[PDB]
């Protein structure tokens, strides 16, 4: 999952926008911070193209 | 034993403790204060005090709900939060905590209190360690458990509000209001314990001690009345569990503190002492209250002593709570029910 | 010899107490002073108790420095440095005593002014253990210099 | 020798044992008196217990002092150590049980005044450590001077 | 010489010993009495245990005074020396243990005022170390003579 | 000389033991006085018990004072210092350890009279190591001893 | 000589060891016992399990008495002061361990009565330190003795 | 001599280690046996892992008595101290770590039985430093084997 | 001499080292594999750290061992003493690094697995030490031995 | 020569004094300029009163440095090396005093700087006890600079 | 002798610090790397400094172990423990300083990044005490032996 | 000699003193530098103040190094030992109170920029004291020094 949502950031993000565009790269699911999870609900960061990540 | 004595910090709390006491309120002040039914009266006799002062400076002859609410704010601030600043070593930490330790129960009343919209800056008089302008509001505005932590780290020393924090984040007492409240005071009374424990080499502890331990048994009594009437939920934290060693284990205290009423615990509990656990909440409300003033009296003839500084603190939320009673019963013309009733306060 | 060290002794202990005594006494007035301050005059006269134990223990040092022996012996040294000792830990044990009653004793002056007095009497009663030290001291350092010196 | 020492050792010790019994009881004294002012009275006695051990204990040093001769050995010296200790840790002790009971004793005058006097009986009873030590302490002083072994 | 620090020995321990009691003892009794006065005379006799040690100290101490010659070898020292620690250490646990019942038995009085007796008898028990170790010291050096221990 | 200091550590050792095994004692049975006032009987059982250690004790110091001589050599001297040890120690040991079960026993003893006898025997456990250091004490000194020229 | 202060190590050491095992074991039995007074006689086996090696240490010593002579010469003296350590320490050892053990598991009796075996279980592992010790002193002793020179 | 100490240093210490790891663990288990019981297999091989320390240490204390002679060689002596001392504090530490690690431990056995096998893994890696031990400690012995010649 | 205690210096620091290395570590990573079952692998390898130091520590004991068993003198003594060292306190101190970030790693380890290479990486640097002991340890041994010599 | 540990002493010790009394009344200064920054001026001249210690120190030092050349007398030696000592700990210990009540002080100031010249006076008593020790010390070192004479 | 001093002294103390100062930083780097997976490159920086430390200690010790022979001078012997000394109790300080700012620096790495220089400016402030032991340390080893020890 | 310990002294505690200031300073700028991202230059001067002091050892240092001879003198000794004594302790306690001033002086900067000149002033107050022994050694050490073999 972690290598999936790298290259498709790198390589469609441009799309987007160069403002859209921000580096919070990386995954916790450990409840020891919040930061580092996408959302474009959140002004913390946002997606960079349209992508949502399904976890059932 | 005792005059072995060298702490700056301590002589420099206990001189302000002691300037205090040539003002202080006292049982005698309470029992002239009850007869009053004018309002010219009761102002005159209070103005002496420490409370008193604030009362001198603004003349007010409707004795409203409001300007105790004022006077609260004053005074906790004068004598408590300006104090710890001008402290240092393990002086300044001990009275923190036990300051921090009426705070850990008001911070998630006003939180849960934010879920339900109750208020958002807006606290109110309690012992407190710091005021409605620092770090109250911050705490108060939030309804996630992670912004709590966040705040908590900006005062240094750390909370023990962080430990209990973390517990709390787990669902180990659910959401439900009472389960929660119920686990903080068990944690409130073990704390305080360790921190006496670590102190006493220094100072001599007999009545401190003593009500201490009396304090955690009223309290083990209070949450099993609450509790009754509504079935005591055993598995989740909301029974006081508590080192005796004495006619009490740990086994005791824990049947005793939920509901259940067991009478084998009560005979352990009490067999000379007024308070003996009644499905009563009146006759031991007002046996508390005299029973804890008790001990914390005697206490402040020890001087330049970690004792003293514990007794203070616990003696001036019973007396915010006497003066609230007080005052707002005269601005409207009746007498006071708890206040009458007993003659130690 | 030990004569000297005798003198040294003496300087130290003594110089302790009354450091203790105004240190703890200090600390006391400080706190007065942020809820009523005119009682200065009263609460500044626990420190000064503190500060003649001092000047008796002057006396015994210079006295020993003069009654020093030629090159002195093992005996000789020995008065000599019981002499310095014994107005020393006398003058501690007063010390000791002034700042932990004189501290009390001036949030005893916060409370009430007029009832300090008693507090003062209280003071010198604590004086008098360096004095009986003051006075052994004295013919310790005399006993070294008799039996055409020791 | 060692005799000037056990001078020391005994004025020093009662001393510290009179400080720490003054000092305990005056920080209750000052807490009650601040109150009531009427018990100033009642507390000066608590206080002179302490001060009146000291006395004893200046005798024996008197002795002592007077019973150096001249070069002893220390045989000699060691008699005469013996004694000084006897006074000076039997006053260090009883100083104690004078302060320990006497802040206590504050709390009590002030609940029962009645019973200001049933106190005075109990403190008393550690003044009798101090009469042990020293008449011991004279027998022992007498004897010890040989002024070089006997 | 061993002799003098013998009877020294008895006389610190002991004292200490007293002391404790005394002083723990009392401090249960100011408080008992804020409640009832008419325990004084149940009260008082836990606290007058622990005095009445020293007493027993003092016929031994008195008797290794008179003992102690003016030449003494190794041999004498030891057993006058060994004499004073014994009583004064026995001296100084049943003192302490004395002081510790003497202040709850005091608090047992306050609540219950028949079972007076039992604690009395409770107290006996551990005056009982300080016989003991009397009797040991007293005989070792009657028993010893060495030149009646000179 | 060594074997002297041997009569008191056996009585002193065990002496301190039972004294704090008393002392413990006590303050659990005055507290569970207000509990049940009828507990006289079976209180007496834990408090006296390990003051028997010291009664063996006292008989097995008369043994090596009798057998005392004028001369001991350093090889005859740690024998019986080293068996005063033996009985010393196990009651310093035993009285620490009958204390400590004693007191929280009578919280045992008040609410289930017939587990009375199950206290005592925990206790009586300890007491094993008294007997057999008194034992072991006797055989050495009987060893050791040949009375004075070593 | 040297083997009465081994003799001394082994009664003293593991006398300690036992006192501590009943002590921990015997406050937690005190405890469980106002709740479940039918698990007594399970109860009864975790106390005494640190009891049985207890009485192994006191024999070793009874053992070096009988083997000890007069005087001895530092060779055969040196092999007695090691075997006497070995059952001291290991006794001591091992006697607070199973007293530490069984407390906390006196409290999971009292939950689980069926499980009392299993406490049971975790306490003989620690009897190897004490039982191993006992049979190496034991031997060395026997092997050792001659009256100088092994 | 410095055999005897060799002896002291291998049964003292590694006689602590296995009882620290012992009572450690035991904490653990006993709370951990009412949630879970029958996993008390699991439980116990934790427990015996540091008694098997001990028995090493002894082993080779019996030989280091053999190889001390009464020639006394200082340096042939020293490998024989050294030689106790290696297997000793290599012993308790091996036992200080388990226990903390078995402590740990159990919490895991309760929550994740499966992987019990993970704390093992952790526990049986502080085994390699009583190997260490065992080794340089054989060796050393074996070269001092010689009767101390001079 | 000191070469003896060089021999055991190596394996009484080197262990001790290592086992606090081990506990610290052991109980963070023991109550962190509840959360996840998947990080025993990864766990594992901060605690084998501290397992490292040890064997290098037997490589320059065990040639210690073959240059001892004779009687030496001051300079072989020296020269060994100072190898011990080196291999003693690199093992002590590479080993109480390695617990401390160990712990708050596990942690790290947990959270990141790619930032787990970083957590390797600062003790890494403690292993430096270990290396540095040794290397200095095994130039000297091979240079100490001269046999004799003062 | 003993001499030079004289020099250094009174710098030493002083220093520490002037360090200590600095620190303290430092972090009290550092905090009230914050709250009230116009009381900056009123703050700084307690601190600086501590300061006042070290410069008597260097004085005594530089004078006897300079009389010591390479050669002085064994007796000369030791009254100069007590000299010393006597200025170093009154410093020392007058360090102490100044640094309590000037960190106190300037607390005081924060919430009432009416009495801020208070604070100052009693400072002012405490530096007595350095004063009169100066001179002790002065006379000592010039006569016993003589060579055999003081 | 008094070489092998000088070489112990250098590898033991110098080590220390190092194995310190990398523990120490490692604290908050672990906290810091979970919270941002990021700030790796700045974290490697303040950790790795305390290991340069250790190499420049290392450079001393080497040149003293060559130097190293009980046959030497005093001089030589001497010069090492200078040496020794030197490096290694600045080395530990210089440890102590690069752990406490380094923990304490991780906050100021994850907030500004721009700020993160400042961290490297303090630590480049302690690394000057690293330099003044090892600069002594060197030069007293080229005057030991000639040519930088070769 | 006794001078090489004067070389040790010099160089060990001034270093101390540095440390102990940078440390302590840092931890408050660290906090400072997040709580105000612009008094980065504010910030950097405090902790800088501490280690300037090394360098006036350093000179001390490298002097008495050089002139170490093989056996020197007594009383020439001495006086090259306390020229380092002096230096070594006046840069600690300087350095001690730079570092508890220090960490106070950094929220007078975040707080008050106008202040800042204040919390300097106070750091260089006990700037003297490092300075003033640096001095008086100096002196000493002109006298001491001669060159190799003093």
Sequence with gaps: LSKCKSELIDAFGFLGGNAFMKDKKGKINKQDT???????????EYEPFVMYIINL | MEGVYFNIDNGFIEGVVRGYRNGLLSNNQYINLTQCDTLEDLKLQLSSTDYGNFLSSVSSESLTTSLIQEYASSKLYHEFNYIRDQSSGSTRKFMDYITYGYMIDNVALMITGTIHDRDKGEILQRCHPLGWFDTLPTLSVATDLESLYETVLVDTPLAPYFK????????????????????LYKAYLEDFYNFVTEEIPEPAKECM???LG?????????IALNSLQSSDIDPDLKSDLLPNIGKLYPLATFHLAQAQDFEGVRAALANVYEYRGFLETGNLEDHFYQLEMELCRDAFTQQFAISTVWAWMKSKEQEVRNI??????????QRERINNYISVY | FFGAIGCASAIIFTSLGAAYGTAKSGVGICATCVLRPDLLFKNI???????IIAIYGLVVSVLVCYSLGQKQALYTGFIQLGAGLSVGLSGLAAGFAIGIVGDAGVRGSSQQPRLFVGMILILIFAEVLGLYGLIVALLLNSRATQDVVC
């Design chain 2, 324 to 333: 609230t009673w007080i005052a707002e019963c005269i601005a409207q013309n």
């Design chain 3, 45 to 51: 006269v626990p420190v000064i108790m503190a500060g």
């Design chain 2, 164 to 183: 209990n924090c973390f517990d709390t984040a787990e669902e180990l007492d659910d959401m439900n209001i009472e389960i929660i409240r119920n686990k």
């Design chain 2, 214 to 222: 009396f304090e955690a048994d009223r309290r083990s009594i209070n």
């Design chain 1, 34 to 44: 919040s930061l580092h999870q996408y959302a474009s609900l959140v002004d913390t």
């Design chain 2, 209 to 211: 001690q003593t009500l």
